[PDB]
Scaffold this motif. Structure first.
Motif, PDB file in Angstrom:
ATOM      1  N   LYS A  21       0.805  -1.199   0.000  1.00  0.00           N
ATOM      2  CA  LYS A  21       0.000   0.000   0.000  1.00  0.00           C
ATOM      3  C   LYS A  21       0.860   1.282   0.000  1.00  0.00           C
ATOM      4  O   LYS A  21       1.825   1.426   0.760  1.00  0.00           O
ATOM      5  CB  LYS A  21      -0.983   0.027   1.155  1.00  0.00           C
ATOM      6  N   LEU A  23       1.134   5.026   0.940  1.00  0.00           N
ATOM      7  CA  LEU A  23       0.546   5.915   1.966  1.00  0.00           C
ATOM      8  C   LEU A  23       0.692   7.441   1.668  1.00  0.00           C
ATOM      9  O   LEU A  23       0.056   8.285   2.328  1.00  0.00           O
ATOM     10  CB  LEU A  23       1.080   5.538   3.359  1.00  0.00           C
ATOM     11  N   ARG A  25       3.123   9.558   1.940  1.00  0.00           N
ATOM     12  CA  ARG A  25       3.888  10.372   2.869  1.00  0.00           C
ATOM     13  C   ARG A  25       5.266  10.747   2.267  1.00  0.00           C
ATOM     14  O   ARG A  25       5.484  10.598   1.050  1.00  0.00           O
ATOM     15  CB  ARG A  25       3.980   9.663   4.220  1.00  0.00           C
ATOM     16  N   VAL A  31       6.695   6.098   5.272  1.00  0.00           N
ATOM     17  CA  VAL A  31       5.700   5.432   6.088  1.00  0.00           C
ATOM     18  C   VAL A  31       5.029   4.381   5.243  1.00  0.00           C
ATOM     19  O   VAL A  31       4.516   4.694   4.161  1.00  0.00           O
ATOM     20  CB  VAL A  31       4.656   6.360   6.645  1.00  0.00           C
ATOM     21  N   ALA A  44       1.018   1.164  10.937  1.00  0.00           N
ATOM     22  CA  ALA A  44       1.899   1.989  10.090  1.00  0.00           C
ATOM     23  C   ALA A  44       3.341   1.888  10.573  1.00  0.00           C
ATOM     24  O   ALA A  44       3.587   1.853  11.770  1.00  0.00           O
ATOM     25  CB  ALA A  44       1.435   3.421  10.077  1.00  0.00           C
ATOM     26  N   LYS A  46       6.902   3.737  10.351  1.00  0.00           N
ATOM     27  CA  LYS A  46       7.602   4.963   9.912  1.00  0.00           C
ATOM     28  C   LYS A  46       9.092   4.761  10.105  1.00  0.00           C
ATOM     29  O   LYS A  46       9.512   4.509  11.226  1.00  0.00           O
ATOM     30  CB  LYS A  46       7.142   6.174  10.708  1.00  0.00           C
ATOM     31  N   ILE A  78      -1.866   9.734  17.742  1.00  0.00           N
ATOM     32  CA  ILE A  78      -1.521   8.424  17.214  1.00  0.00           C
ATOM     33  C   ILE A  78      -0.734   7.644  18.285  1.00  0.00           C
ATOM     34  O   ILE A  78       0.164   8.179  18.939  1.00  0.00           O
ATOM     35  CB  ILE A  78      -0.748   8.556  15.880  1.00  0.00           C
ATOM     36  N   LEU A  94       3.351   2.279  14.486  1.00  0.00           N
ATOM     37  CA  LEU A  94       2.291   3.160  14.917  1.00  0.00           C
ATOM     38  C   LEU A  94       0.948   2.482  14.695  1.00  0.00           C
ATOM     39  O   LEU A  94       0.768   1.661  13.752  1.00  0.00           O
ATOM     40  CB  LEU A  94       2.298   4.470  14.116  1.00  0.00           C
ATOM     41  N   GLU A  95       0.005   2.828  15.541  1.00  0.00           N
ATOM     42  CA  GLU A  95      -1.418   2.646  15.221  1.00  0.00           C
ATOM     43  C   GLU A  95      -1.687   3.071  13.761  1.00  0.00           C
ATOM     44  O   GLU A  95      -1.221   4.124  13.337  1.00  0.00           O
ATOM     45  CB  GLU A  95      -2.218   3.557  16.149  1.00  0.00           C
ATOM     46  N   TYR A  96      -2.430   2.269  12.990  1.00  0.00           N
ATOM     47  CA  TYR A  96      -2.729   2.615  11.608  1.00  0.00           C
ATOM     48  C   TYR A  96      -4.023   3.438  11.564  1.00  0.00           C
ATOM     49  O   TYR A  96      -5.065   2.994  12.019  1.00  0.00           O
ATOM     50  CB  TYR A  96      -2.865   1.350  10.738  1.00  0.00           C
ATOM     51  N   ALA A  97      -3.970   4.598  10.943  1.00  0.00           N
ATOM     52  CA  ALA A  97      -5.163   5.461  10.796  1.00  0.00           C
ATOM     53  C   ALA A  97      -5.697   5.267   9.380  1.00  0.00           C
ATOM     54  O   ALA A  97      -5.283   5.942   8.427  1.00  0.00           O
ATOM     55  CB  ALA A  97      -4.777   6.901  11.057  1.00  0.00           C
ATOM     56  N   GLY A 100      -6.712   7.866   6.488  1.00  0.00           N
ATOM     57  CA  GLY A 100      -5.795   8.781   5.853  1.00  0.00           C
ATOM     58  C   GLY A 100      -5.939  10.224   6.352  1.00  0.00           C
ATOM     59  O   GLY A 100      -6.443  10.489   7.447  1.00  0.00           O
ATOM     60  N   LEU A 149      -4.916  12.778  10.997  1.00  0.00           N
ATOM     61  CA  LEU A 149      -5.422  11.628  10.275  1.00  0.00           C
ATOM     62  C   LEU A 149      -6.800  11.235  10.809  1.00  0.00           C
ATOM     63  O   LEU A 149      -7.258  11.745  11.843  1.00  0.00           O
ATOM     64  CB  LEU A 149      -4.425  10.454  10.278  1.00  0.00           C
ATOM     65  N   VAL A 162      -0.617  13.258  14.127  1.00  0.00           N
ATOM     66  CA  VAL A 162       0.659  12.590  13.827  1.00  0.00           C
ATOM     67  C   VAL A 162       1.795  13.594  13.624  1.00  0.00           C
ATOM     68  O   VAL A 162       1.574  14.803  13.559  1.00  0.00           O
ATOM     69  CB  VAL A 162       0.568  11.617  12.597  1.00  0.00           C
ATOM     70  N   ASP A 163       3.006  13.028  13.631  1.00  0.00           N
ATOM     71  CA  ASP A 163       4.269  13.646  13.304  1.00  0.00           C
ATOM     72  C   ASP A 163       4.699  14.744  14.259  1.00  0.00           C
ATOM     73  O   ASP A 163       4.502  15.962  14.009  1.00  0.00           O
ATOM     74  CB  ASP A 163       4.316  14.147  11.862  1.00  0.00           C
TER      75      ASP A 163
HETATM   76  C1  LIG Z   1      -3.948   6.832   0.240  1.00  0.00           C
HETATM   77  S1  LIG Z   1      -4.997   6.101   1.501  1.00  0.00           S
HETATM   78  C2  LIG Z   1      -4.105   6.348   2.998  1.00  0.00           C
HETATM   79  C3  LIG Z   1      -4.553   5.625   4.093  1.00  0.00           C
HETATM   80  C4  LIG Z   1      -3.886   5.707   5.304  1.00  0.00           C
HETATM   81  C5  LIG Z   1      -2.762   6.519   5.443  1.00  0.00           C
HETATM   82  C6  LIG Z   1      -1.997   6.538   6.695  1.00  0.00           C
HETATM   83  C7  LIG Z   1      -2.229   5.867   7.834  1.00  0.00           C
HETATM   84  C8  LIG Z   1      -1.329   6.190   8.907  1.00  0.00           C
HETATM   85  N1  LIG Z   1      -1.388   5.731  10.184  1.00  0.00           N
HETATM   86  C9  LIG Z   1      -0.445   6.224  10.993  1.00  0.00           C
HETATM   87  N2  LIG Z   1       0.534   7.083  10.703  1.00  0.00           N
HETATM   88  C10 LIG Z   1       0.540   7.533   9.440  1.00  0.00           C
HETATM   89  S2  LIG Z   1       1.683   8.761   8.945  1.00  0.00           S
HETATM   90  C11 LIG Z   1       2.656   9.024  10.441  1.00  0.00           C
HETATM   91  C12 LIG Z   1       3.681  10.112  10.276  1.00  0.00           C
HETATM   92  O1  LIG Z   1       3.734  10.542   9.062  1.00  0.00           O
HETATM   93  O2  LIG Z   1       4.367  10.546  11.179  1.00  0.00           O
HETATM   94  C13 LIG Z   1      -0.374   7.118   8.494  1.00  0.00           C
HETATM   95  S3  LIG Z   1      -0.628   7.591   6.848  1.00  0.00           S
HETATM   96  C14 LIG Z   1      -2.342   7.267   4.343  1.00  0.00           C
HETATM   97  C15 LIG Z   1      -3.002   7.178   3.133  1.00  0.00           C
END
Ligand SMILES: CSc1ccc(-c2cc3ncnc(SCC(=O)O)c3s2)cc1
Length: 284
Positions: A21, A23, A25, A31, A44, A46, A78, A94-97, A100, A149, A162-163
């Protein structure tokens, strides 16, 4: 010569599998989605490089991990599950969000299914998270909508901040910088509140309040607080929403309300129609 601190990469690959997948980022702190081989649960991952721009970053990464650990009990932030390390990377699990970015709901591209009621709920949840951070003397300093997210979009889920790469105690994207950042005035919790103002504005108008033709124009818009509040842009936005945004998008950081005061704003006061309201005039 560097010794590794966190769990081995061999253990990472034993316990998790990366998915294909995308993401969306950064290229410098990748990520990826991953899955626990034992449980099937999505996370997730990172991958933070320890060496960036010719500088050792491990101390900074350790600080970021310390901040996430302090916010574990806040469901608006997160959750950190595990930490791994290899020669060049520290990997946060990380916990997955799954929803998005909240940014997706702010697009011109989207002809929208986002009601003011939903915006009210999302802003309230953001404020709950930021209140929690500010109460612990953490200022995020990078609350662009790309860093907020959602646990889902179908249906619309809950906020996950996040971040914490820029977070401090009491050089971002130009359009998201507070005026105090542009004047090198010191860091205040009020900077985050400015960003909440931007988030609300973008959710409601699907337009960026400060971005210009170029960076010079963006900086002009921010330092002058030149914001489009025209009747056209705001014909479907309530006065109370307008008030909330206008109380935040002010030049002088000391005049912005706190996250706590924001949570009492009239805009955010709403009764769930499925609950039985108990009025002031009682039956006795
Ligand atoms: C294109 S569909 C999509 C679905 C989910 C996500 C993401 C899920 C998710 N769960 C946790 N952390 C992150 S980014 C954490 C960070 O950038 O520090 C992220 S980005 C990003 C895109």
């Amino acid at each position: 010569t560097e010794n590794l601190y966190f769990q081995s990469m061999e253990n990472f690959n034993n316990f998790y599998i990366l998915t294909s997948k995308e993401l969306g980022r950064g290229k410098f702190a990748v990520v990826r989605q991953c899955i626990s081989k034992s449980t099937g649960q999505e996370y997730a991952a990172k991958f933070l490089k320890k060496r960036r721009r010719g500088q050792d970053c491990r101390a900074e990464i350790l600080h970021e991990i310390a901040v996430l650990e302090l916010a574990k009990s806040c469901p608006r932030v997160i959750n950190l599950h595990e930490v791994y390390e290899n020669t060049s990377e520290i990997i946060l699990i990380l916990e997955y969000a799954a929803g998005g970015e909240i940014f997706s709901l702010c697009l011109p591209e989207l002809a929208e299914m986002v009601s003011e009621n939903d915006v009210i709920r999302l802003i309230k949840q953001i404020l709950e998270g930021v209140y929690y951070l500010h109460q612990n003397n953490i200022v995020h300093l990078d609350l662009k909508p790309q860093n907020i997210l959602l646990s889902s979009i179908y249906p619309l889920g809950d906020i996950k901040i996040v971040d914490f790469g820029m977070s401090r105690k009491i050089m971002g994207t130009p359009e998201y910088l507070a005026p105090e950042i542009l004047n090198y005035d010191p860091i205040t919790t009020a900077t985050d509140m400015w960003n909440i103002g931007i988030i609300a504005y973008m959710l409601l108008t699907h337009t960026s309040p400060f971005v210009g033709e170029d960076n010079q124009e963006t900086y002009l818009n921010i330092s002058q607080v030149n914001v489009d509040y025209s009747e056209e842009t705001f014909s479907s936005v309530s006065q109370l929403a307008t008030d909330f945004i206008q109380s935040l998008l002010v030049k002088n950081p000391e005049k912005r309300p706190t996250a706590e005061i924001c949570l009492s704003h009239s805009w955010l006061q709403q009764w769930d129609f499925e609950n039985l309201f108990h009025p002031e005039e009682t039956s006795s």
